[PDB]
Design a protein around this ligand. Structure first.
Ligand SMILES: Nc1nc2c(ncn2[C@@H]2O[C@H](COP(=O)(O)OP(=O)(O)O)[C@@H](O)[C@H]2O)c(=O)[nH]1
Ligand SMILES: [K+]
Ligand SMILES: [Mg+2]
Length: 301
């Protein structure tokens, strides 16, 4: 089962899930073993606090049941790590708004624009009318690429001149979306690295200006982070969550990275739903996040 997800997670399975089988083989449950497991969880980018939680619960479960052979930890670890991901299993529901506004936040390079395009295509396949807002206003090649993309896919793209105020572009886009009976409006934003404080102030301005037209907008504040950046994904999530207030996360580029275990750190540290995971190049490879599928693929033996 889950052949495609298992292949996308092949390098992560070296360190987690089925990867624990070799660590436990023929070993006894003692402090040495838990020290080896802690190290391996840390190597897998599970994170300091999340690893401590797992080890604590696992040790108590092992002692209370008086488990002796390390192989018996496998099922317990599967349960512990599965409960971490279950807490952020909640698919995005865009139904019933006019438009449903998604504010896409994140740094450049992580897959933010790619994810916008895949989401837009998926929503249109579901029968929705989609509009995009080109809010990354100082990156002229990026804006024109999004426009060319919209023209190729017959999806309207709201944009202004290079250097325009992002909040003004997004205001015009919400106005146009309402006038055109748009179901989903997806707003891109800047993701530049220099002067982080300026970017965060820009996002708060965008939200305030949105609410001049619809006090419920943005209905979703979605962060995109890149699993191949390891703990940088965690630091980015903390930055954007404290700055604007996230309501969903997309985790991209799980395929071909050994750092996929960072998903447990993101889930445990923030408790924000993971709406989608990117596990390949297809439109359909931006898949809704399902915790039990992910755990089954990871721990399959
Ligand atoms: N392997 C892989 N590459 C991805 C995925 N999602 C996005 N990318 C690539 O990440 C790169 C950066 O994407 P972009 O959307 O341009 O990044 P932004 O700066 O955050 O907008 C592009 O080459 C995308 O194709 C994914 O799930 N898997
Ligand atoms: K305005
Ligand atoms: Mg972009």
């Amino acid at each position: 089962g889950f052949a495609r997800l298992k292949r996308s997670l092949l390098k992560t399975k070296e360190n987690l899930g089925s990867g624990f089988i070799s660590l436990f083989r023929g070993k006894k449950i003692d402090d040495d073993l838990f020290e080896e497991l802690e190290e391996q969880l840390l190597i897998a980018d599970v994170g300091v606090e999340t690893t401590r939680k797992i080890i604590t619960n696992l040790t108590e479960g092992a002692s209370r049941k008086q488990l002796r052979d390390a192989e018996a930890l496998y099922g317990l670890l599967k349960e512990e790590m599965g409960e971490i991901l279950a807490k952020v299993d909640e698919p995005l529901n865009v139904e019933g708004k006019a438009p449903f506004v998604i504010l896409m936040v994140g740094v450049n390079g992580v897959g933010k624009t790619t994810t916008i395009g895949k989401l837009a295509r998926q929503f249109e396949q579901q029968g929705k009318s989609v509009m995009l807002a080109a809010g990354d206003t100082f990156r002229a090649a990026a804006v024109e690429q999004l426009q060319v993309w919209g023209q190729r896919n017959n999806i309207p793209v709201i944009a202004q001149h290079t250097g325009a105020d992002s909040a003004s572009v997004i205001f015009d886009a919400i106005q146009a979306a309402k006038a055109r009976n748009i179901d989903v409006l997806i707003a891109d934003t800047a993701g530049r690295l220099q002067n982080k404080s300026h970017l965060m102030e820009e996002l708060k301005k965008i939200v305030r200006v949105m609410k001049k037209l619809d006090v419920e907008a943005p209905h979703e504040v979605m962060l995109t982070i890149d699993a191949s950046t390891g703990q940088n994904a965690v630091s980015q999530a903390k930055l954007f969550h404290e700055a604007v207030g996230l309501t969903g996360i997309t985790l991209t580029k799980l395929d071909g990275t050994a750092k996929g275990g960072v998903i447990f750190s993101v889930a445990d540290q923030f408790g924000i739903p993971i709406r989608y995971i990117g596990v390949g190049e297809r439109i359909e490879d931006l898949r809704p996040f399902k915790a039990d599928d992910f755990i089954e693929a990871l721990f399959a033996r």
